[PDB]
Amino acid sequence: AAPKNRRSIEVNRCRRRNPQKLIKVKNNIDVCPECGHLKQKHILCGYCYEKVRKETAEIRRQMGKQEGGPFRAPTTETVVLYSGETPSEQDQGKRIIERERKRPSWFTQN
As measured in angstroms, the least distance from the Cβ of 61 to other proteins is 12
Looking at residue 98, the DSSP 8-state letter turns out to be: E
Nearer to other proteins, 59 or 85 (CB): 59
Query: Which of other proteins, Zn ion, none binds 3 (CB below 5-8 Å, type-dependent)?
Result: none
Cβ contacts of 32 within 8 Å, gap of 6 or more? 38, 39, 45, 47, 48
Q: Could you tell me if 58 and 99 are in contact, meaning their C-beta atoms sit under 8 angstroms apart? A: yes
Select the span of 3-11, 20-28, 82-90 touching other proteins (CB under 8 A).
20-28
Question: According to CB under 8 A, which residues from 74 to 103 bind other proteins?
Answer: 74-80
Amino acid identity for residue 4 in this structure = K
Q: Among 5, 27, 86, 109, which residue interacts with other proteins (rule: CB under 8 A)? A: 27
Q: Among 13, 14, 29, 34, which residue interacts with Zn ion (rule: CB under 5 A)? A: 34
SS3 63: helix
Q: What's the CA dihedral at 37, 43, 48, 51 to 10 degrees?
A: -140
25 binds other proteins (CB under 8 A): yes
SS3 48: helix
Chain contacts with other proteins (rule: CB under 8 A)? 16, 21-23, 25-31, 33-36, 38-40, 42-52, 54-56, 59-60, 70-80, 104-108
